[PDB]
């Protein structure tokens, strides 16, 4: 029971009873949360609790010290003082944001903003309490006992009763019962294992709620700017592929941390990739949340880097297949490319940390406690899409609120900007431009004369609650037998039910837009399904409509995006 206030640093034996995490807090801070919640319960080696037979008062501001013992009102003795008087619960060594964050249920979008505006160590309460906020919601679902088998992707599954049925896509990773991870879609519901296992009937599956451990690092490591590049070694022989970041790697070796915000095909992974070239002996761990995200850090890297000193860290329980190229689970190779979950406990010269939109101010924590660096860069991009945030029903979170490092890019701005997008027909950059990186993104590639737009509502309707547009599904159908080079397009979607129907009738690979981000396609059609605050989403649009390289057929709901795409409208 000795420990330091997580609001001031005091140390006390004081630990809130109530509070998820259980807190430690100093008498003068205990006293502020627990006048001030419904937070009543202190702990120290003992809790504070009416020391008298049978009697159950718990409330610290009913209770007294009676000697070297406690007891409440009805049971204190003559000499007995007040556990909680003269702003003080009695201790040993004798924060309106805290109590909030110590009582929200993570439903509002006004949580999330407090647990970004707040201090450093309330940044840290905040995303411990909201994770294991998060995981102990995971053990309210229902249960699904598989009632028949169909074939090798299909089966037939029953629920628990008086428990809620779990949203069915690849955001909900199920364990199935110990016979690995596995996925659902959609009587027929297709069935997605992580290892192959002979489906079997009354073998049942769980949301495995892993464990939430304690936070001790900052999200960010205090700043440090520093007047000559230190601890890393540059080239002057850098080749001219690289010759556009120099003046920015070397921003890199003169600061502790920095942030590099870049929009769609601006070159994160060639700046990624090219500050290896030009730190040529500096030992790099490149980390980002998804396996997906540090593949495509690997394969940048496997054409630039020499693929001996590389390796790629595979956690033992194998959930989705990921990069094979390199030597897998060597520690000690110069070049570690790693996901946050399966950091190892390591240094570095410099840690690269990409796709900073999808990182939470707990994985910005991890990162910061497993790995100890000279420097640290932030590459990512806060107009793209952040992690789900499963128990947010209430409002939409803004970019500045993602994590402390979008926070930054939000408000002081990023450290470098990679102005110039090399991916996308000029039409789709003038979009995102003005939508969302105030003109500041500049289009390398003319005018394609490939991207369309379509104004068409169609019909809604609704698989449980992702929905399905097919009359926009039947004009995209109809465009494609009148733009037949279109046949090698990806269907994109802002929901996994409208790419099911379109899978089967357009037959064109399919995509969320979420699954989407980082990716690049020749063609993409997009249907927007619905008006909604999901599809309107701006992050998202921006996402969906720069994945093409070449041409674009946006078949749209909002009035709204539809005006503000800079595209050839079409009739039907
Ligand atoms: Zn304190
Ligand atoms: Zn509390
Ligand atoms: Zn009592």
Known sequence: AVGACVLCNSQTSLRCGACIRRPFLCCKCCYDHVISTSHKLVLSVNPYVCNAPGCDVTDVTQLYLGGMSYYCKSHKPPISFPLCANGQVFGLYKVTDFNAIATCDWTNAGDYILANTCTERLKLFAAETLKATEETFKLSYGIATVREVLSDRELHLSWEVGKPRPPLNRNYVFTGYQIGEYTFEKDAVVYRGTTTYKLNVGDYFVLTSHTVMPLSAPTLVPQEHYVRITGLYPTLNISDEFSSNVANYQKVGMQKYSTLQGPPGTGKSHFAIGLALYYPSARIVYTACSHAAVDALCEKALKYLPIDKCSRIIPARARVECFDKFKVNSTLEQYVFCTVNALPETTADIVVFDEISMATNYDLSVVNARLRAKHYVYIGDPAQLPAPRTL??????????????????????????????????????????????????????????????????????????????????????????????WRKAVFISPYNSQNAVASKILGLPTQTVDSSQGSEYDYVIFTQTTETAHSCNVNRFNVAITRAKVGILCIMSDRDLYDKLQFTSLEI
């Not at 803004?398 to 002081?412: A, D, G, H, Q, W």
């Not at 105030?438 to 369309?452: E, G, I």
Request: with cysteine; proline share 5%.
């Open 392 to 485: 947010l029903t209430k409002g939409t979170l803004e970019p500045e609120y993602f994590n402390s490092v979008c926070r930054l890019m939000k408000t002081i701005g990023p450290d470098m900007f990679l102005g110039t997008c090399r991916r996308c027909p000029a039409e789709i950059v003038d979009t995102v431009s003005a939508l969302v990186y105030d003109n500041k993104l500049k289009a390398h590639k003319d005018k394609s004369a490939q991207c369309f737009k379509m104004f068409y509502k169609g019909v809604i309707t609704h698989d449980v609650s992702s929905a399905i547009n097919r009359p926009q599904i039947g004009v995209v159908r109809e465009f494609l037998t009148r733009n037949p080079a």
